[PDB]
Design a protein around this ligand. Structure first.
Ligand SMILES: [Mg+2]
Ligand SMILES: [Mg+2]
Ligand SMILES: [Mg+2]
Ligand SMILES: [Mg+2]
Ligand SMILES: [Mg+2]
Ligand SMILES: [Mg+2]
Ligand SMILES: [Mg+2]
Ligand SMILES: [Mg+2]
Ligand SMILES: [Mg+2]
Ligand SMILES: [Mg+2]
Ligand SMILES: [Mg+2]
Ligand SMILES: [Mg+2]
Ligand SMILES: [Mg+2]
Ligand SMILES: [Mg+2]
Ligand SMILES: [Mg+2]
Ligand SMILES: [Mg+2]
Ligand SMILES: [Mg+2]
Ligand SMILES: [Mg+2]
Ligand SMILES: [Mg+2]
Ligand SMILES: [Mg+2]
Ligand SMILES: [Mg+2]
Ligand SMILES: [Mg+2]
Ligand SMILES: [Mg+2]
Ligand SMILES: [Mg+2]
Ligand SMILES: [Mg+2]
Ligand SMILES: [Mg+2]
Ligand SMILES: [Mg+2]
Ligand SMILES: [Mg+2]
Ligand SMILES: [Mg+2]
Ligand SMILES: [Mg+2]
Ligand SMILES: [Mg+2]
Ligand SMILES: [Mg+2]
Ligand SMILES: [Mg+2]
Ligand SMILES: [Mg+2]
Ligand SMILES: [Mg+2]
Ligand SMILES: [Mg+2]
Ligand SMILES: [Mg+2]
Ligand SMILES: [Mg+2]
Ligand SMILES: [Mg+2]
Ligand SMILES: [Mg+2]
Ligand SMILES: [Mg+2]
Ligand SMILES: [Mg+2]
Ligand SMILES: [Mg+2]
Ligand SMILES: [Mg+2]
Ligand SMILES: [Mg+2]
Ligand SMILES: [Mg+2]
Ligand SMILES: [Mg+2]
Ligand SMILES: [Mg+2]
Ligand SMILES: [Mg+2]
Ligand SMILES: [Mg+2]
Ligand SMILES: [Mg+2]
Ligand SMILES: [Mg+2]
Ligand SMILES: [Mg+2]
Ligand SMILES: [Mg+2]
Ligand SMILES: [Mg+2]
Ligand SMILES: [Mg+2]
Ligand SMILES: [Mg+2]
Ligand SMILES: [Mg+2]
Ligand SMILES: [Mg+2]
Ligand SMILES: [Mg+2]
Ligand SMILES: [Mg+2]
Ligand SMILES: [Mg+2]
Lengths: 159, 185, 58, 172, 60, 61
RNA sequence: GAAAUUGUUGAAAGGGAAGGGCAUUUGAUCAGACA
RNA sequence: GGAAUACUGCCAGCUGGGACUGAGGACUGCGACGUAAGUCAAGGAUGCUGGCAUAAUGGUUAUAUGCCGCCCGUCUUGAAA
RNA sequence: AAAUAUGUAAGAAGUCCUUGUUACUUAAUUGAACGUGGACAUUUGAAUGAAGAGCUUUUAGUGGGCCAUUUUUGGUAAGCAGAACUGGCGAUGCGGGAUGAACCGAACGUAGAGUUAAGGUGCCGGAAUACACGCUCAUCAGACACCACAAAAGGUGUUAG
RNA sequence: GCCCUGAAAAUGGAUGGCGCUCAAGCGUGUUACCUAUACUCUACCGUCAGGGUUGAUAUGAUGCCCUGACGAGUAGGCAGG
RNA sequence: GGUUGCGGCCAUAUCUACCAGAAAGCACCGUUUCCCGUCCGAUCAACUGUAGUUAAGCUGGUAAGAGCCUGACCGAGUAGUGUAGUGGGUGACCAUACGCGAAACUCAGGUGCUGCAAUCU
């Protein structure tokens, strides 16, 4: 009959990475989390306590609690036509901060500068990002670069 | 044909008249449809809808809920509008003066109100005394204090009061309500 | 008589009829499942900043 | 694919920071409109270098007109093509008055004799057989004999009324 | 029109302001035996570059 | 026009800028369409056949 | 004193069923409107 | 050397034949032409002429003709079965 | 180690400054959390769209399903049995595939003009017995997807290589 | 490549039928042409929606007027009759 | 720069073989009364820093070395794949259209970086 336990189907998911087994490097424990940090979730197969169920593997969420050896993460999991709120208790080995926001933060303080830098200058800002624009006209020179004519090849084999 | 992005022929789902059939209501509404078309004042638009409201959505405002709203900082001379009925509240002793403008004043209410030198005002009187609704305070009854809502939302771990007649122990208080009878909600 | 066993055919049509409603979000979430030592202190903490923010309109 | 045109098409890989001004390659594409011709161009470059449209740019696109459009010519044609059971290299000779006329009838031949649709054919080279007796194919050679003449026997005047009152005649 | 064709700074507002045009079918026809192949394959769909003007005009 | 000639004069090739504006026509009926294109045909306001709208060109369109 | 169903009389159509839809010829029949 | 033409495209260039439609019902708007008074093809047909004033046009009906049309109800994945 | 598919982010619930509260926490007015006061508006922080968004209560029918392309399990197979995504039939007529639940085209208020789709234009039957270049002659020729089947193997018939 | 052999079933019979052989057959190209309940323009019905209008001294305020979009349907809901 | 004590990243740090290392540090090394541990003062514990040495640990350098790391229009726009068609084919399968795009291969270049504290010709 079918089988459906808590780690079923997690063969490679909780595997270790090639030549990467053993002790977990100590930096994993000197990281510090506060509430409100966004973290990404990757189970560490060695550390069996405080493990995320396979579903939250690859998922990302907000820290909502901080305790001795773990953090509480909330994840919106969609079930049926709708999300519910699942909160996870995860040990600090199955969690890493998320760079998903770094660009944003980077961009803000980036923005806030040219914002002032050009205010104290002479207005004229423009600081929304814009999608890639189709490129402009341009002239290509032939000097040192006459076009090398090519043609399709015939059929061969070599075997 | 058209990839319809949205359901076709939807009604707005907001009332348009009172579902009432009382002339006098019908008349008041005549007033304020006029008043709300031709006077760019928000208060009239608000009042007009409130007349279409049905009994449930018109929960009673009490005279004691009124006195509190005048205890509002800087709001002691404004005139309370209530698009519903006003009821008496024996629990307050020193009810103030002012002017209440409502659909209906229960006997005790209007009594208490005038007993302190107040004034009770049909909304059409309120209309003429203050077209643009100048200096009004609209109060609203507690919609969700109806007994019926106690039972809305029922399900496990929801804390919500069974639809149940005869109550006491022996009435849904065993298995599924306590860790020592199967389980708890 | 056997009969079909299981399918999810048509199931997402249905889920989409009336949404997949985005999670909905609030400023001030619950403290549900937050450490008790924290909540306990935090309480008395707030009580204070309350009390002394009353002495501001004295 | 239609009535054909010829096209100098010239593209290059997109300029980069370490490689501004890349190498520039030409093909002479035989197609019906420019749009198809650029498409074919990319088709063959991706089958020769490491570019694709996304990573490259078209630099120019110019139709080449016949040199002497009113002179009969003997063409040698070279073609890679796909049959049902494997692919094949080929040489035919077409005798017409332009490269465009020729390439037209080529494709019509491939269609007819080897059931080869336009997708299934690469023109390899098309060029003008200059000195005769470099003409290698009977069905063309035949037309080079001197003081050539022939009848057009059993002729058929196409009628224009449904009935006729004579009884026709194929003299010519 | 100037705002459209030159893709102006206010092109979002400009463009959206126009209700999606409603053309008839082309007056010649599609010029193809079968519409739902790519242009390049002798069908009608995909980018056909400047050749869109001949069509839209037939349908206008 | 004179750019194109002036570069031809120099032996150089003149490549004009990528087009920035396109005009789209829904050329297909309403039914048997897969979901993701179906949405995009909406978001581009082409929700019925032979109707056309203008599209500003960037990657994200 | 309805219907099914039947006799008569009148009209009509009918090359292995009948009945139906759009349309008009033909026949029969009828309104309204002119002023 | 200097032309022409094809081809593709543009014109707020001119112009002919034909078909369907004529909603609206004082005025009001945007314009156009006029030096002007005016005028207009500019927020939906008017002018002129003739025919019957009737079964002419029209309804209804029967039949003929062209094309089309399987028995309804039901249960069912599926019924003319 | 892909392609497709899939979690999060793209601001006012934002970013900084000053320095209160506590019983938690620190060697520590250390920190954690929650605040008070202040500084910066819509190029306020990508695109496209939006006949608006949000929320509540109650109740029907249903809970035998089947088909298609693609992914796919069992089986020699099946118009067989069983899954995955989407589109459909069921519940739906209309044009095409003569015919036909499921293919193609296209989804229906009553109508005039126009244009088309898919599919066609010898005659049945509206529409070129059109143009063009080759191929094919069958004493069981062949003739349009789904589709109403044919294979190995052969031919000094003929065509081009 | 086309063609021919390989190629055997039971009522008489099917490229849909007649018939077609420089095709009315196969492969391919170019035009034109035919016609869906679809598309475009218009009238009319209805549904939803957004405006306007209680001013008497005439006739519906659930009304009157302007405007825009939309219209498939079993089981099933509701509504107006 | 060296070295030590504590480290971060965890082979560009490993592996094999040779050679070289001033000074300081580490090291090996002396001892068995004492705390301590063993079948064995080898390991472990204690004592000296005294009697000895760079032999080894350690550090560096060499090698058409093994491994490992980086790169490239090397292979390869290949394999695979998302979309399309009343495309081809008896089928198996296959081309084409708009996109996305590997792994092996081959060639070249490298062979620890660095944080806190003390020390040292
Ligand atoms: Mg199992
Ligand atoms: Mg290990
Ligand atoms: Mg355990
Ligand atoms: Mg009670
Ligand atoms: Mg109570
Ligand atoms: Mg079964
Ligand atoms: Mg079942
Ligand atoms: Mg030439
Ligand atoms: Mg025309
Ligand atoms: Mg025509
Ligand atoms: Mg014409
Ligand atoms: Mg066709
Ligand atoms: Mg037109
Ligand atoms: Mg748009
Ligand atoms: Mg009697
Ligand atoms: Mg009739
Ligand atoms: Mg009129
Ligand atoms: Mg009229
Ligand atoms: Mg009469
Ligand atoms: Mg008469
Ligand atoms: Mg009769
Ligand atoms: Mg009859
Ligand atoms: Mg019939
Ligand atoms: Mg039954
Ligand atoms: Mg059955
Ligand atoms: Mg039946
Ligand atoms: Mg996504
Ligand atoms: Mg998503
Ligand atoms: Mg946005
Ligand atoms: Mg918009
Ligand atoms: Mg809106
Ligand atoms: Mg329900
Ligand atoms: Mg139910
Ligand atoms: Mg049920
Ligand atoms: Mg399908
Ligand atoms: Mg059923
Ligand atoms: Mg259908
Ligand atoms: Mg039919
Ligand atoms: Mg058939
Ligand atoms: Mg299709
Ligand atoms: Mg016939
Ligand atoms: Mg005909
Ligand atoms: Mg086929
Ligand atoms: Mg054979
Ligand atoms: Mg042969
Ligand atoms: Mg046959
Ligand atoms: Mg035929
Ligand atoms: Mg043919
Ligand atoms: Mg013709
Ligand atoms: Mg119609
Ligand atoms: Mg309906
Ligand atoms: Mg509907
Ligand atoms: Mg020394
Ligand atoms: Mg001892
Ligand atoms: Mg010793
Ligand atoms: Mg020791
Ligand atoms: Mg040594
Ligand atoms: Mg050491
Ligand atoms: Mg090596
Ligand atoms: Mg693919
Ligand atoms: Mg196929
Ligand atoms: Mg292949």
């Amino acid at each position: 009959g079918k089988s459906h336990g808590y780690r079923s189907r997690t063969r490679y998911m909780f595997q270790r990475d090639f030549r990467k087994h053993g002790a977990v490097h100590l930096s994993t424990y000197l990281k510090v989390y506060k509430v409100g940090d966004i973290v990404d979730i990757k189970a560490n197969g060695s550390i069996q306590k405080g493990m995320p169920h396979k579903f939250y593997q690859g998922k990302t969420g907000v820290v909502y609690n901080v305790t001795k050896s773990s953090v509480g993460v909330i994840i919106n999991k969609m079930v049926g036509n709708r999300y519910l709120e699942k909160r996870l208790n995860l040990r600090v080995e199955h969690i890493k901060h998320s760079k998903c926001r770094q660009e944003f933060l980077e961009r803000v303080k980036a923005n806030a500068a040219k914002r002032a830098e050009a205010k104290a200058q002479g207005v004229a800002v423009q600081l929304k990002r814009q999608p890639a624009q189709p490129r402009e006209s341009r002239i290509v020179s032939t000097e040192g670069n006459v076009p090398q004519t090519l043609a399709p090849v015939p059929y061969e084999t070599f075997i | 044909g058209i990839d319809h992005t949205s359901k076709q022929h939807k009604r707005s789902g907001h009332r348009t008249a009172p579902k009432s059939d009382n002339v006098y209501l019908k008349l008041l509404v005549k007033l304020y449809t006029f008043l709300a078309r031709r006077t760019d004042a928000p208060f009239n638009k608000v009042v007009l809808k409130a007349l279409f409201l049905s009994k449930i959505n018109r929960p009673p405002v009490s005279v004691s809920r009124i006195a509190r709203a005048l205890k509002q900082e800087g709001a002691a001379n404004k005139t309370v509008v209530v698009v519903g009925t006003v009821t008496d509240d024996a629990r307050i002793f020193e009810f103030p003066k002012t002017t209440v403008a409502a659909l209906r004043f229960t006997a005790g209410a209007r009594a208490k109100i005038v007993k302190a030198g107040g004034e009770c005002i049909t909304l059409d009187q309120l209309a003429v005394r203050a077209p643009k609704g100048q200096n009004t305070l609209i109060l609203r009854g507690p919609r969700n204090s109806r007994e019926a809502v106690r039972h809305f939302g029922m399900g496990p771990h929801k804390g919500k009061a069974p639809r149940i007649l005869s109550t006491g122990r022996k009435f849904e208080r065993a298995r599924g309500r306590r860790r020592s009878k199967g389980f708890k909600v | 008589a056997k009969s079909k066993n299981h399918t999810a055919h048509n199931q997402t049509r249905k889920a989409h009829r009336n949404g997949i409603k985005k999670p909905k979000t609030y400023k001030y979430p619950s403290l549900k499942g937050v450490d008790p030592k924290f909540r306990r202190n935090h309480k008395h903490a707030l009580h204070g900043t309350a009390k002394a923010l009353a002495a501001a309109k004295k | 694919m239609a009535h054909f045109k010829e096209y100098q098409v010239i593209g290059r890989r997109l300029p980069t920071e370490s490689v501004p001004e890349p190498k520039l390659f030409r093909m002479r594409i035989f197609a019906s409109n420019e749009v198809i011709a650029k498409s074919r161009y990319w088709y063959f470059l991706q089958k020769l270098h490491k570019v694709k449209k996304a990573s490259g740019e078209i630099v120019s696109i110019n139709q080449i007109n016949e040199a002497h459009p009113t002179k009969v010519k003997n063409f040698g044609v070279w073609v890679r093509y796909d049959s049902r059971s494997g692919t094949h290299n080929m040489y035919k000779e077409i005798r017409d008055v332009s490269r465009v006329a020729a390439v037209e009838t080529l494709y019509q031949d491939m269609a007819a004799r080897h059931r080869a649709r336009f997708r299934s054919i690469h023109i390899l080279k098309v060029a003008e057989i200059e000195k005769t007796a470099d003409v290698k194919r009977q069905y063309v050679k035949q037309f080079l004999t001197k003081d050539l003449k022939f009848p057009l026997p059993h002729r058929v005047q196409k009628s224009t009324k449904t009935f006729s009152y004579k009884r026709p005649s194929t003299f010519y | 029109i100037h705002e459209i064709i030159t893709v102006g700074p206010h092109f979002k507002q400009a463009n959206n302001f126009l209700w999606p045009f409603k053309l008839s079918n082309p007056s010649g026809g599609w010029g193809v035996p079968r519409k739902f192949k790519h242009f390049i394959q002798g069908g009608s769909f995909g980018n056909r570059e400047e050749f869109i003007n001949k069509l839209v005009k037939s349908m206008n | 026009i004179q750019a194109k000639r002036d570069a031809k004069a120099a032996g150089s090739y003149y490549v004009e800028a990528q087009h920035k504006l396109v005009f789209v026509v829904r050329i297909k009926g309403i039914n048997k369409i897969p979901p993701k294109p179906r949405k995009v045909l909406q978001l581009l306001r082409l929700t019925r056949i032979n109707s056309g709208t203008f599209v500003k060109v960037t990657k994200a369109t």
